[PDB]
Design a protein around this ligand. Sequence first.
Ligand SMILES: [Cl-]
Ligand SMILES: [Cl-]
Ligand SMILES: [Cl-]
Ligand SMILES: [Cl-]
Ligand SMILES: [Cl-]
Ligand SMILES: [Cl-]
Ligand SMILES: [Cl-]
Ligand SMILES: [Cl-]
Ligand SMILES: [Cl-]
Ligand SMILES: [Cl-]
Ligand code: NA
Ligand code: NA
Ligand code: NA
Ligand code: NA
Ligand code: NA
Ligand code: NA
Ligand code: NA
Ligand code: NA
Ligand code: NA
Ligand code: NA
Lengths: 500, 500
Amino acid sequence: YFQGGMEFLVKSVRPETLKTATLVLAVGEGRKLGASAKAVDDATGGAISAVLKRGDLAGKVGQTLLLQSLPNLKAERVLLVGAGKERELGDRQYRKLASAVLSTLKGLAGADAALALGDLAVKGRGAHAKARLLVETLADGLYVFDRYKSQKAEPLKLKKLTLLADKADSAAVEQGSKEAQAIANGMALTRDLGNLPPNVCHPTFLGEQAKGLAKEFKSLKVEVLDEKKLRELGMGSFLAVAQGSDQPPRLIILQYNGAKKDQAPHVLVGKGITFDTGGISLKPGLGMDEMKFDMCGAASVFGTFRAVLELQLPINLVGLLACAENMPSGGATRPGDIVTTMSGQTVEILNTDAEGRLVLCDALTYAERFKPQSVIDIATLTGACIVALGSNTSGLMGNNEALVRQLLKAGEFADDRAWQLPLFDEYQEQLDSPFADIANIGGPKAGTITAGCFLSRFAKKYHWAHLDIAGTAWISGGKDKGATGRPVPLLTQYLLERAK
Amino acid sequence: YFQGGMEFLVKSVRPETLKTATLVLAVGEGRKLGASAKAVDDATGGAISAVLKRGDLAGKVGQTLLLQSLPNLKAERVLLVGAGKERELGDRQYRKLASAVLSTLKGLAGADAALALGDLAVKGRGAHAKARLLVETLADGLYVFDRYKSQKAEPLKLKKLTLLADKADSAAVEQGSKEAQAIANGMALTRDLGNLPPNVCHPTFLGEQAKGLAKEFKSLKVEVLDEKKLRELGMGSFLAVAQGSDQPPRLIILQYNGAKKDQAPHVLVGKGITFDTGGISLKPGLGMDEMKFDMCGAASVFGTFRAVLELQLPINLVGLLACAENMPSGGATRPGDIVTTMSGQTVEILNTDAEGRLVLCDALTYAERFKPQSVIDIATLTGACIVALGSNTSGLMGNNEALVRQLLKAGEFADDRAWQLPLFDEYQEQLDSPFADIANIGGPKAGTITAGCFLSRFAKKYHWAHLDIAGTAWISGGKDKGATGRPVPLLTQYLLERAK
Ligand SMILES: [Cl-]
Ligand SMILES: [Cl-]
Ligand SMILES: [Cl-]
Ligand SMILES: [Cl-]
Ligand SMILES: [Cl-]
Ligand SMILES: [Cl-]
Ligand SMILES: [Cl-]
Ligand SMILES: [Cl-]
Ligand SMILES: [Cl-]
Ligand SMILES: [Cl-]
Ligand code: NA
Ligand code: NA
Ligand code: NA
Ligand code: NA
Ligand code: NA
Ligand code: NA
Ligand code: NA
Ligand code: NA
Ligand code: NA
Ligand code: NA
């Protein structure tokens, strides 16, 4: 169940007799009230119709009108929210409607609210799929990160949200709500870890977080490998990234065995660069505070595990979090260094700011021992991905078409979308080095793709895919600056489908 | 008395019978010789008039004509200096005249010179105020910094300067000269500390300098706090600046009790960043050698104390020098770090090159314990101040209008001027952070002001002002590159007035 201060219930009772602090109804733009709103209007003797006739609420998506006590209702307030003029909403409009409702309710002193929104239609979504989107939007919309504020906002009075559904849909709605709550809990852990400042959130801290998660979930086993063990394993490019920082690196291994021992596991590999200065290839100063989000890949592995552990899915899951801090220093890796990866391939490190792939490639080699049926790495890897796909769609590459399709489908269902980019063999020659087996960077052309090509050289032994979340893992500026928790919804949906 | 190799005397004798190696007289452009010059001309039987009639000296400000022995004079040489055609000189012209005189005298083998310049008028300045400007310009014009030159210039022969004044003005001239000499001595210490290279002038060195000043002045008490004590005090942003450098930080506390114990002290807070690389937010290489001047704020607190201690002013004075070195390293503060200042306010360090305010804010909190009647911080804080006000006028902000006015008036009298910039409440929102109580930088707009706004959040408990000397503390290039010693003249004049 959701942990962020909200209980979500599903009930099949009549809205017009439900006791609640706020009853929420949808109002169309220039079309008749839906069945639920009409039943409530009838119960009040036409009071809602009479208000709407006065014209303050045009009915555009997300517009609101709040009424107090109406005759013959047990609702203390009635919140009208506009649903536009279309027969069906798209996902974006449904989310906008839900967020407008939540924003209003947050500011009220009501301890609960009941959503009578079952008459809304959303393109391509039945009861379960609508509940997944609605509850995830509501629950994630409650997220707060204020532990470093001396002045904290007043706690919400709102503590309970009831979804009204016809009895024939209530089981699907309940299922969707339960899954959405687990996803939102995972997103909240991901966002917390992403938002923590890098002087607190370093690799050792992430190791202790993993141990704490195992304390909470007896089904989770955790092992944390330090720099001595990494050197024993021959993890040369991983160590090269870490060596310039005072902070020691960590390889965190999470294991959950929800299925029979004969089922091959799915492996999630997360880039956990807790801060990325670029190293000797130093980044510019402007906006470099957002490099604390360079561990959002690893954070999303935490969050996906958190959701899976709550749902107790019948799957075998492994998490590999490759965490290091990338700092300049008198002992840092230099451009031109050549290192031997755990696979034995030598890499010429042309640019020390292309370091995510250097911790990932050793983790991908490590993943071979699990004989996985799928391996997915998640990383804030290339600014080129933002040029290619922006901030709303993650880049996706892989060496197996069926797995890539499974991830695309999961992202569509989750409304946490990705988009495939090709790993054509012609791109690989961009990584040729006169000195070593591989150069760690290509040119300025096709940067997201050549990063995927680099990783692919370590993933040939299994079905593998790669999510570039450089654009989707956080919001850069404004009031809403901070980690997003993506791609936890995509990944959790992928695993939900693999668990059937 | 001035310590840089010059004795300054005031005498009321007739210039035309004074024994001296060089007698200095002013000559107007196209107006009759003044009273003193005319008396000397008469004594020579018209020899000076006869030379001037030949036309080599037009009389423009600072032009010179040097004569040898003239009939009936006891002066071995007579130096004529042009004073222009105006009835009164401005401060700039008076300084230019004085510097031209000094430049000539420096090149002569005369052991002394007598200045018969009492007939010069300077706008808004009586005898005391003219003597303040003249002697300070002369004494500071003798400054030399050559300890790293293997080949040193020949020592000056000039060792004594006599100011001739009418008996009715001689007491005021003597007072002005005494104060100007103390100010020039303080400026020389400030300039020395500013000009020292940063591999010599680090925080520990500045601590030893403070101890040495207490050895020289029994009225001064000094305490030097190291990093352990700073951590005990909770000085988190100060420590964050220092942590990347091998050089430990120092908080230097100077105390002078020249008044009764019931008089609240005045506190000077100086930024002593002995070198500023920018840290992880690294500066460009061009001109970064001038970042050794990033401790000129603290240096000016040294210099102001040096002048006050010589004058034995009846005031209670405290100096707080917050000194650290700002270096990149594997343990340096990272953009995005959040730290807790000694006040308890949390700060998100968006840019590690805005570090002066991070050592200053903890020092401003520390200053509360003295129950001060005024607190002035001095810092080379923002390049934006140079854009706003250039290299000749310091920026001034504060939370108390009377104190700001007192400092402006002192700067006008000293001809070491400042100019107020507003700390309107509307600017404060530029420092909002989604994560912490304060961000350490605003945007690119109003950078000098938002830095002052940041400091103001730590100064609410007392009357406070802030001098941005990024433009006035040093000269960037050319033959005269080096520290200026400003704002020691402004600060010392402020304290002279507070001592009445
Ligand atoms: Cl159904
Ligand atoms: Cl750990
Ligand atoms: Cl360790
Ligand atoms: Cl976009
Ligand atoms: Cl799916
Ligand atoms: Cl007088
Ligand atoms: Cl010291
Ligand atoms: Cl020390
Ligand atoms: Cl200027
Ligand atoms: Cl004054
Ligand atoms: Na619509
Ligand atoms: Na839509
Ligand atoms: Na990087
Ligand atoms: Na990175
Ligand atoms: Na290229
Ligand atoms: Na003139
Ligand atoms: Na002038
Ligand atoms: Na700086
Ligand atoms: Na500085
Ligand atoms: Na700005």
